[PDB]
Design a protein around this ligand. Structure first.
Ligand SMILES: Cc1cc2nc3c(=O)[nH]c(=O)nc-3n(C[C@H](O)[C@H](O)[C@H](O)COP(=O)(O)OP(=O)(O)OC[C@H]3O[C@@H](n4cnc5c(N)ncnc54)[C@H](O)[C@@H]3O)c2cc1C
Ligand SMILES: Cc1cc2nc3c(=O)[nH]c(=O)nc-3n(C[C@H](O)[C@H](O)[C@H](O)COP(=O)(O)OP(=O)(O)OC[C@H]3O[C@@H](n4cnc5c(N)ncnc54)[C@H](O)[C@@H]3O)c2cc1C
Lengths: 487, 498
């Protein structure tokens, strides 16, 4: 029947569909399991109609990001605001100390820089980012004060919100990575998705179509089966489901929502690749306040996990990486058990809200209780008040239920909380490609064969794990299949 | 005709480390011929108001994560608890004449666009096709052009001036500086040496005293076909050696390729320096980093930071030209439009009060300013008058009052919150015939190769301009000394049984 069948309507699949059409191609399809397009790009709506990207929210590498450049030109042509450069000077908050950023005596950003060059030098075996930070501290303690030894490691973990992985689950070798310039906050990624999706025959889109299996016949024809019985046959097939999903293609049984049974099975180089690449769990929590009543100094605030001086003496005393490694091994998870990244939306978008980013293992636990508004307010209440105090304000009032308080005005009134759910959603099963302490790109880039091709943020190297990477990978596979068929 | 194993010309850190290595390797009958009445060369520690000491030459140990000289000094300190240095990096304070402090600003966010700029440059040359180099200025104008849609007006105005602190890394005005060589990734924090002289003396002291010959200016070096090298000091003496390690500055060694033998510092080579060496001089130059010390009575200002950069003047008109230019071509035409002031270029001040407790400012300057300011380094009244505006402005931003000129003490006991300037020291590297500049710099490898491969097996070269790792730095100079001394040590070892 069809020329090419695109599986998944994330930005990868959408771009691909866009290309094909743009290449005059016809008779294609976009099969999406969810009842909406966008995949890991979703803009939700909350209090008083405020909108928030619960999925991707920034255009990274604006100096070379091609998706971003395209958006910029559109904006040069029509003056519509599509984004805002929200990079800012980070505010770091510790529970006891308070602010420790731009400190006259702590000079933490400066040692962090050094720490980073140290990381580049170490490589230029591989351990965990946590293990790398310990070596650094050990090897440079002679030139680090006691307060730097205490806090630096906590501040430097802000990188956890970059991969969505705690410093002990994260590969040190992939941790530090330069960026091609500032970041631009998308003021409607849904506008990016919408545009691409409305640039090809709207009749190609088939929502709520979970694909159960993909089969390779002899007669250069591929057969796709959505689990509702309906079956399709096409020339080429572009698979864009998340790596975490695709990975299911090689496990016991075949049920598990999302899993696609391949026929024949996926080659060994492919299945091998899943052994050398994991997936992160970046999550988000939106805190909607009645109105801003705090200082809008910065739009970037990070709260540090708690630290101790007992940790220092062990740095001072340890003789080597083993004495320290063994001395360190010497519960209760709260809002102060890990670093939390808060985007203060008031300064950058004028919205009285906080977009907080979180990592594994915390993400999954918070998303598990996403419907428990009071439990959620109780869990983050401490860091929220600590933030408000540092930003010259008061403790948060809970106004999530009818009948505010009448005596607010000077106190931040929380009106709502929104939480992501990517780790519990079967069609995402996590946030995006991440490294545990490479080859998948090549595996995907080639394909299962000349007609069973792939695409997605995990099928490319430039822009890996990013929206534009997935966007481009969608064009790659697209352009190709196009050149041929066209004939 | 005094016979000697090795003759090292110059007693800077390169020659001193060379001789040191030699001694440490059991080599005797060596000489260190130095023209000045001191050792140290570009490492010199002067004395000023009330016995305060300052390094008018090198001040920092750079790339501490890898710098072998530094690591060697830190080891010592770990053994005796003696403080030999101090990590003085800090959050930079940027002062505009108009806008006052513009650092860490919630709206300007200068350091942030500066970072993106560094990245733009990296992305501009890392992908090395037939690149085509240009001045650093040209590089910045290109950045502003390509990214104007993502920069506010004030960023376009103040970024190009704030990014010029780099002029103080090379000692060159951004119009004279190679863009391709502008950005350098430092291997970690810097360590402010608390007297570099201590490093100089410790090394000097590590080999025979009588090995040293000060105030002897070498004027010629001849290679006898009889497998020996002849060296002549100006004070008539003549020496004969198996090997020679020339460490004169690249600027002085350059004089060798020109006709005119009576130039202070110049060495007449026979045979003349090979063509590969001569021609290498067309491919690298010398910068003019200079210093000025503003000594104060006592500290009556904020010690938030020890790093203060004063930006040069900018104009909203510049913003308009960038906003209206169609390409680099037109931007230059448009940019094409008096006299030099303390605001005509960025200046870098090290507020020592915080970092060392000494109520003084160590200010760095670049070419061409350095030349002009060193040319009048005696007219103190003119110096003060020249640096009064920025000096006052700094003090204002640091919660203090204008400067009072007390360089000629006339009793002042009623100005506790008023800063009193008592002295002004100025470097003199451009006019000193044995330095003729600050160190090697690029105008928009040939040299490092020609030098490292020597004039011939017997005539060798060392110094900050003869090596890649640490080029232009004290530790690179130091390393090159170890390099040359080792090669010879080995050859003299295989010396037909001794
Ligand atoms: C919390 C969070 C924050 C992020 N922030 C940023 C950011 O700031 N900047 C940035 O660049 N990136 C960010 N990302 C990453 C970005 O979202 C992804 O790179 C990009 O959206 C991945 O696109 P994709 O098209 O490959 O897949 P989309 O998920 O990403 O998924 C492919 C599609 O496959 C469908 N599918 C799966 N299984 C089946 C099946 N069996 N049958 C049919 N359809 C199926 C899915 O429903 C989905 O629509 C973030 C991600 C998360 C989770
Ligand atoms: C103002 C200034 C600031 C600096 N700051 C730093 C810094 O912070 N950190 C850093 O790492 N580097 C810094 N440097 C660079 C550093 O000082 C040099 O890299 C290093 O000192 C060069 O050492 P050298 O041994 O090769 O030569 P030294 O000058 O550098 O010179 C070799 C010796 O040869 C002698 N000589 C010359 N001609 C003759 C002759 N004809 N006969 C006999 N002897 C002769 C000279 O007098 C001299 O002593 C700075 C330089 C300047 C000028």
């Amino acid at each position: 029947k069809k020329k090419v069948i695109i599986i998944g309507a994330g930005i990868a699949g959408l771009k691909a569909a866009s290309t094909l059409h743009q290449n005059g191609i016809q008779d294609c399809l976009v099969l999406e399991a969810r009842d909406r397009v966008g995949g890991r790009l979703q803009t939700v709506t909350g209090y008083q109609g405020r909108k928030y990207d619960i999925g991707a929210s920034w255009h990274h590498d604006t100096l070379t990001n091609p998706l971003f450049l395209e958006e910029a030109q559109l904006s040069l042509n029509d003056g519509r605001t599509r984004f805002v450069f929200d990079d800012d000077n980070f505010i770091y908050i510790d529970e006891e100390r308070g602010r420790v950023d731009h400190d006259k005596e702590l000079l933490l950003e400066i040692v962090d820089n050094e720490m980073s060059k140290f990381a580049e030098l170490e490589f230029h075996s591989d351990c965990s980012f946590f293990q790398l930070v310990m070596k650094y501290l050990l090897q440079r303690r002679q030139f680090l004060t006691n307060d730097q030894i205490r806090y630096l490691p906590q501040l430097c973990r802000y990188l956890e919100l970059w991969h969505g992985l705690d410093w002990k689950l994260l590969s040190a070798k992939d941790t530090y990575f330069g960026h091609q310039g500032r970041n631009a906050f998308a003021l409607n990624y849904d506008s990016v998705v919408q545009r691409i999706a409305q640039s090809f025959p709207q009749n190609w889109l088939k929502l709520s179509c979970e694909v159960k299996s993909i089969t390779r016949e002899p007669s250069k024809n591929v057969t796709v089966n959505c689990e509702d019985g309906t079956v399709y046959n096409a020339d080429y097939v572009i698979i864009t489901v998340p790596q975490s999903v695709l990975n299911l293609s090689v496990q016991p049984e075949k049920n598990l929502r999302g899993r696609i049974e391949f026929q024949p099975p996926l080659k060994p180089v492919i299945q091998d690749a899943f052994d050398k690449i994991h997936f992160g769990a970046l999550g988000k929590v939106i805190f909607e306040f009645e109105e801003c009543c705090w200082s809008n100094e910065s739009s970037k605030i990070v709260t540090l996990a708690n630290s101790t001086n007992e940790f220092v003496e062990i740095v001072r005393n340890a003789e080597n990486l083993d004495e320290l490694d063994s001395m360190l091994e010497r519960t209760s998870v709260t809002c102060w058990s890990q670093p939390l990244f808060f985007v203060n939306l008031s300064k950058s978008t004028g919205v009285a809200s906080f977009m907080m980013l979180m990592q594994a293992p915390l993400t999954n636990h918070i998303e598990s209780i996403r419907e428990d508004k009071e439990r959620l307010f109780s869990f983050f209440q401490p860091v929220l008040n600590k933030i408000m105090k540092c930003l010259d304000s008061e403790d948060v009032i809970d106004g999530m239920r009818p009948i505010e308080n009448i005596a607010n005005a000077n106190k931040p009134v929380l009106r709502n909380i929104i939480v992501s759910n990517w780790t519990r959603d079967p069609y995402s099963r996590g946030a995006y490609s991440a490294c545990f302490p490479v080859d998948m790109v090549v595996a995907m880039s080639n394909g299962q064969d000349s007609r069973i091709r792939f695409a997605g943020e995990h099928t490319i190297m430039d822009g890996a794990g990013c929206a534009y990477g997935a966007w481009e990978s969608g064009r790659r596979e697209a352009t190709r299949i196009s050149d041929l068929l066209k004939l």
